[PDB]
Amino acid sequence: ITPATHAISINPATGEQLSVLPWAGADDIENALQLAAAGFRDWRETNIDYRAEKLRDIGKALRARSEEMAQMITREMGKPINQARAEVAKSANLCDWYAEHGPAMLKAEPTLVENQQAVIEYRPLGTILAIMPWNFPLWQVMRGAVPIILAGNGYLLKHAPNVMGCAQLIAQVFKDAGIPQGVYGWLNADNDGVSQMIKDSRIAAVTVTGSVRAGAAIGAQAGAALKKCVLELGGSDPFIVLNDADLELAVKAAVAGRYRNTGQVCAAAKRFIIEEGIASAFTERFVAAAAALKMGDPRDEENALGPMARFDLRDELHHQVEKTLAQGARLLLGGEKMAGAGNYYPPTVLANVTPEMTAFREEMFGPVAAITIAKDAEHALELANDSEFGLSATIFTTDETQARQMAARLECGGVFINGYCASDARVAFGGVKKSGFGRELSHFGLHEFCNIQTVWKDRI
Amino acid sequence: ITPATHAISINPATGEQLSVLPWAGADDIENALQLAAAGFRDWRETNIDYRAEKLRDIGKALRARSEEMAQMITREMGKPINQARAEVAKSANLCDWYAEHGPAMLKAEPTLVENQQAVIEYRPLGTILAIMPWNFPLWQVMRGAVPIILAGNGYLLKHAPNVMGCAQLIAQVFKDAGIPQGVYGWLNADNDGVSQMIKDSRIAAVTVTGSVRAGAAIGAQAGAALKKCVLELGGSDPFIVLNDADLELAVKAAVAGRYRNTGQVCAAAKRFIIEEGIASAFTERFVAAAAALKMGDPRDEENALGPMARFDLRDELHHQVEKTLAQGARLLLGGEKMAGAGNYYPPTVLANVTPEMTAFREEMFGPVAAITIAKDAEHALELANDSEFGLSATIFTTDETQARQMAARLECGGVFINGYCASDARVAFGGVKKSGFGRELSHFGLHEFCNIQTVWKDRI
Ligand SMILES: NC(=O)c1ccc[n+]([C@@H]2O[C@H](COP(=O)([O-])OP(=O)(O)OC[C@H]3O[C@@H](n4cnc5c(N)ncnc54)[C@H](O)[C@@H]3O)[C@@H](O)[C@H]2O)c1
Ligand SMILES: NC(=O)c1ccc[n+]([C@@H]2O[C@H](COP(=O)([O-])OP(=O)(O)OC[C@H]3O[C@@H](n4cnc5c(N)ncnc54)[C@H](O)[C@@H]3O)[C@@H](O)[C@H]2O)c1
């Protein structure tokens, strides 16, 4: 057993090894690609209304294993159990939502060509290779798999190596739903196996949810293979609070946005940018509220935070904290690794964070808030856009006109005005800059992996 | 002067050197990137109706230099002068079309979120680097530049090195129209210069129209730099004729589709796939019609074909003809380089072309038709899909239902039934497989380089 030969699951609350799974071999890869190719060949011929009904079947099979799934999520990566349950319910509802609204988004599109000669058809592309992360082991898979399969594609999952118990359980749910094994499939492939599949003609495109470094490594290969990719990568979302904000609501949303899933959220509020007049009141309220978050065993529902998922990533997070403190930030809360067998890092708040500091320029993928003072709203917008990332953003202010104007100038894919940032089937998700490109959910996730095909009759 | 240090224009009809231009230097690249960034910063703030009026100004300035532009196209790459005039007219009309229909396509999109709390906004992305080919030196630039700039982006053109006279004239047209500095720009960059620009933060995304080899080279770099790209690459379009086809119309469309622009068309009919019962009658009519095409001085309007654009590519095309004849195909017309100072290659027809031959597997980017016999309609579909390419396709048959079913199974981005394949502002354009990914024209070309942004108010 070694990370060079096996995927390994470890409980981050206890440090105990849970399972191992060897990398797929040459024959496993070939068999997966044959099954995927055969599955897509038949699935692409099915009726759209039949596929919608199969989505409802997926939702039912998932709910039927909802607690088994939630406990597996919590066990493998440390998520508080009620958050894992909420992840299951949101994933199941996504099946029903696309079942109801998806088919109409795939209807032929008329054009302005005379005599109704030309229409746009949304054709399936093929089998989509999907590379997914551990922070939402179910939702991240379902977010793409549901629309991708509804559009008549196949989906081939390469999951993160620390949640292969989750991966096998998801496959069992799709099996329970009667989804053919070619249509939803999966492989415990190492990175070289991923490389081989991208080069294989039976993979039509790639979708990646992960870090910036993974997106660049995989995106380069997809381009070299002339395969389209969607990259949903890291974020360092700004959370702007102006002097006229609803301060109580802003702090509630600020705390929820930073510390949900023990801070391990792509679109988490990570860089708090507070106008000078309200900064002292915001900072004091935010520290007190963050300090009231209980942390411990994620099977105990009194805990708002669990351990972080990966011991090496807690080390990396603490290193970023220490560098930021050494650069001149002030420690207001937390900021030390909990001793013991568990991978615990307490709610942490860093103040006097300047744009030159590590916690302002890197993704802080854990329960570490950075607080930066803005001279005014113009400064707050400049601070917000001064980032390699560009996934999402929040603005708190009672001047809705100003909020709308700032939203137009924020370099990110989502802007929440006076509310709680989240993903939702009804709206687009995805960012700009090093957060990547392409859009998921709504009709965007349905169309990203369609062959958009012009059919033009009698052009004479 | 050597192609190692300079871009060189040579008149293919005469062989005379027209112009030379050294590659852009480090200062030139930096200057262009600075002005692109500043131009985009101000351009993104303008009102959509102002930008629509500026598109009309581009169309006016282009029509004012229409004969000068047409003659420059013909002089640098050999296109018959009336096709160059048509290219200018189509490009000017594209400006007016997007001016009229573009703004509504950029309006905010309602969502299913209750109480109208969330909309989808189509924001500008930044400066788009555009890598373009010589076969339509004006239209390829305008096809993307017009919607890209209408959406509030900037456009930085890296044109093919044999048409830098066209590139400079295009820039003069944008100057005549009053397009602000850095909103439209261009550089005579060598391949390393392109690599540098892709890695530069002031390039937001890349669009490529060119060969499969260029798309793989550039696409890999875009992915590694986390830049979205659109790849519009080569084609080897099938042209299927079944026994019940309107034979006279099929032959007319077959000759027009193969030999327009002296065959140098991405979506040209390149692989003719004819059902056995009608193959002899098709082949004899096609040879006779192809033989009736006049070739010569492209400034003379009686000539349907000019010389090929590049002397090295004629050598390459003839090598493809020789290899295919060596593999067992039959030469029915043409098939030898014309003697003299001009780069002329006659209309050529190769028959008994089987799937294993060079003319069936590679893009024949010149006036060479390949004819393959299909046993039946299912064999024809299989033959059509047995290709690395997948740009467009044509089916001729009076059985509309069968044509619609084949269209759904053709692995390509466009299918023309009983008609002449062409690009048009009102429909999507783009392919699958090694022909690339992404879509141009209609609302697709407008949205490819937008930041699709959710704006959600009061999500509490
Ligand atoms: N934008 C989004 O939608 C979104 C959603 C969730 C998480 N994320 C991001 O995910 C990241 C954390 O999750 P992570 O730790 O699993 O990131 P990660 O990149 O290290 O791992 C992501 C996935 O990519 C695979 N992978 C990584 N490198 C690879 C390579 N060279 N070849 C093939 N496969 C490779 C991993 O095995 C894993 O399955 C954070 O940056 C977070 O912001 C983004
Ligand atoms: N799909 C489409 O919309 C479309 C339209 C027109 C032409 N084409 C294709 O264009 C091709 C012919 O034009 P071409 O001969 O100029 O193709 P080409 O690939 O040789 O050159 C295309 C462009 O890419 C640039 N380029 C090539 N390699 C590069 C590299 N490594 N780095 C940076 N830049 C590079 C060239 O300088 C040129 O500007 C044909 O294959 C044709 O089918 C496609």
Numbering used by the authors:
A (entry chain B), B (entry chain A): 3 to 462
Please, what does the article write about this entry?
In microorganisms, SSADHs operate in the degradation of various nitrogen-containing compounds such as putrescine or arginine, where they prevent the accumulation of the toxic SSA intermediate. We show that Sad, which primarily functions in the detoxification of succinate semialdehyde in various degradation pathways, does not only accept closely related substrates, but also converts phosphorylated sugars as a side reactivity.
To understand the molecular basis of the improved enzyme activity in the Q262R variant, we solved the crystal structures of both Sad WT and Q262R variants with bound NAD+, as well as in complex with both NAD+ and SSA. Further kinetic investigations revealed that the Q262R substitution had significantly improved the Km of Sad for sugar phosphates. While we were not able to obtain structures with sufficient electron densities for the alternative sugar-phosphate substrates, we manually fitted E4P and GAP based on the NAD+/SSA-bound structures.
